[PDB]
């Protein structure tokens, strides 16, 4: 379908591997928030978005609904379960790298199915964790996923960073590499 | 590896010439095959594959269901719409230009939004259009765009950047 | 205020 | 629908209201009614599964549905003021017509 | 909010008298609205209801929903003995899942 904007009023997700969930709005490709199920209250992911209030009940009893469709396609489909995609990784700047000026790295995992993968960073060999964010699974046509996540750092020519990605649909762990 | 059952539901909203034209298809899918979908073209539940024909068959038999569903067009997409009108379309980032000489040239357009951009490689107020191979538009998913476009040159070189959230155009200066 | 689409149940 | 019509129960003990609902409906509501009020939601079952939860006043109050079937309302360390009639409703989801139960009326005596 | 606040005190009539139960709603977005009768010694059960504007008739009672008032007023205009009983009016919003807003009731007792 051809269109100006469109937007997924309504992104909803609910797995069966360690019951797993996930609301989100999304418009043009971007997230505008998404309900945290474990505690019961939305975050918004545009500061001009707070203004507004979303219920995070509906949320959790809308990703009910979907465990009881589920529950119910898994005895009708006599247990065909969801097959594993080899993920695209990808890593860059946000803006161009000068060292000593504040940057953030970004890793992008793309053709996420099913919808369960680490993303870890790594410095030198070493796992970081701190300044490290993610975003949700962002939903695509082929109803497949992808998730983007960041690192803040000051580049300088002694640190190199590598992005970890673990996934069902790979033989291995893969690493995609970053230098100044 | 474990086996994985997932289940997916779409409230889609399509919007085009603002509110001239707006389309809703909800979506339900089993792992990645959509199995029952609403459009508000049709104006009642189409079972995609056979898997969601009782589901199709009986939600289309319910006149509550298909009256809410069939008014989802003007109480969601419409309504909502009014929304964007004053947050997400009304957002301006002004994108950040520079050039960088690592025989070639890298001019790097960080950091806007809306996505609508236009870049332009001038050789002495001349427009080279050959030896120019741009990446694709990039989404850096904090709601802002970048995008580099590289020049073959062999040696003033000015990239021109056209953007809605610009009062003129930018223009970027190199030897 | 943002409104969403709930999914029906199946029978 | 619902299997017990009135009870009695001591305050500080513990009771357990069952209802058994339509064969086949999937949906399913509990509501309260004190006296000289309106029912008021309690939970929503939609399967086995709870769907929302809000309507129960405290931790004391507990509902579960196993089976998907049968559901079972416990409140614990009962007060005078948990004394009222226990509603009980079924469906097929949202927009579909819903069936109310007779009620079972709770009434605590210290 | 979603609140429903209707008549109150018990409305006593005679035979072949016109009846009305005032009903008053808010609601953030598009509700259906429904009335609900409960005779002496059974369990709730739906009279009518109404799903769009300018829109219920069962037994001879009469509502019309009106979003202009805000309103879903039961009229009958030749009650009968058998009517009497509890009148309830109910609400149900797009977003509610068929959680039903009730709001107290209205005792009804028609004298011969």
């Known amino acids: 379908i051809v269109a100006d904007h469109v937007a997924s009023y309504g992104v909803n997700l609910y797995q069966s591997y360690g019951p797993s969930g996930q609301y989100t709005h999304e418009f043009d490709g971007d997230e505008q928030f998404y309900v945290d199920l474990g505690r019961k209250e939305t975050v918004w992911c545009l500061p001009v978005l707070r203004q507004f209030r979303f219920d995070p009940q509906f949320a959790l009893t809308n990703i009910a609904v979907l465990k009881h469709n589920l529950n119910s396609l898994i005895k009708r489909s006599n247990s065909t379960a969801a097959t594993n995609e080899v993920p695209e990784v990808t890593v860059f700047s946000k803006s161009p790298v000068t060292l000593g000026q504040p940057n953030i790295l970004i890793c992008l995992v793309d053709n996420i199915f099913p919808p369960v993968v680490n993303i870890t960073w790594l410095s030198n060999g070493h796992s970081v964790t701190e300044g490290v964010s993610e975003t949700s699974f962002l939903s695509k046509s082929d109803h497949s996923f992808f998730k983007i996540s960041y690192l803040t750092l000051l580049p300088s020519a002694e640190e190199s960073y590598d992005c970890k990605v673990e996934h069902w649909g790979l033989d291995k762990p893969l690493l995609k590499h970053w230098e100044p | 590896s474990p086996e994985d059952f997932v289940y997916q539901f779409k409230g889609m909203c399509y919007f085009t010439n603002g509110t001239e034209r707006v389309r809703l298809v909800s979506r339900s899918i089993y792992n990645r095959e959509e199995i029952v979908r609403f459009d508000s073209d049709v104006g009642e539940f189409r079972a995609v594959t056979l898997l969601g024909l009782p589901a199709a068959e009986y939600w289309n038999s319910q006149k509550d269901i298909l009256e809410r569903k069939r008014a989802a067009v003007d109480r969601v997409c419409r309504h909502n719409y009014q929304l964007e009108l004053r947050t997400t379309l009304q957002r301006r980032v002004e994108p950040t230009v520079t050039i960088s000489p690592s025989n070639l040239l890298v001019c790097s357009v960080t950091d806007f939004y809306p996505a609508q951009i236009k870049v332009r490689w001038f050789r002495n107020d001349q427009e080279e259009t050959a030896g120019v191979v741009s990446t694709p538009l990039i989404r850096n998913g904090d709601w802002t765009f970048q995008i580099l476009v590289m020049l073959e040159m062999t040696p003033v070189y000015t990239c021109h950047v056209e953007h809605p959230s610009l009062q003129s155009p930018i223009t970027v200066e190199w030897r | 205020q943002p409104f969403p689409q709930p999914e029906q149940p199946f029978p | 629908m619902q299997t017990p019509s009135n009870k009695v129960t001591e305050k500080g003990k513990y009771v357990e209201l069952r209802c058994d609902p339509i064969?086949?409906?999937?949906?399913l509501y509990w509501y309260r009614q004190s006296l000289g009020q309106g029912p008021e939601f309690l939970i929503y079952?939609?399967?086995?599964?709870?769907?929302?939860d809000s309507g129960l006043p405290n931790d004391r109050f507990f509902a579960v549905r196993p089976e998907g079937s049968v559901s079972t309302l416990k409140i614990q360390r009962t007060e005078r003021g948990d004394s009222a009639v226990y509603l009980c409703?079924?469906?097929?989801?949202?927009?579909?017509?819903?069936?109310f139960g007779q009620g079972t009326r709770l009434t605590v005596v210290e | 909010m979603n609140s429903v606040t209707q008549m109150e005190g018990p409305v006593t009539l005679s035979e072949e008298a016109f009846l009305t139960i005032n009903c008053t709603y808010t609601?953030?977005?598009?509700?259906?609205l429904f009335w609900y009768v409960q005779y002496p010694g059974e369990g709730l059960q739906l009279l009518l209801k109404?799903?769009?504007?300018?829109d219920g008739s069962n037994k001879g009672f009469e509502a019309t929903y009106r979003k202009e008032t805000t309103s879903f007023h039961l009229e009958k205009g030749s009650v009968q003995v058998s009517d009497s009983a509890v009148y309830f009016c109910?609400?149900?919003?797009?977003?509610?899942?068929?959680?039903?807003?009730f709001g107290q009731g209205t005792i009804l007792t028609v004298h011969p």
């Open positions: 079952f939609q399967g086995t599964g709870a769907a929302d």
């Open positions: 409703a079924s469906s097929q989801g949202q927009d579909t017509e819903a069936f």
């Open positions: 609601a953030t977005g598009y509700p259906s």
């Open positions: 109910a609400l149900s919003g797009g977003t509610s899942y068929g959680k039903l807003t």
């Open positions: 109404a799903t769009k504007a300018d």
């Open positions: 064969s086949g409906h999937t949906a």
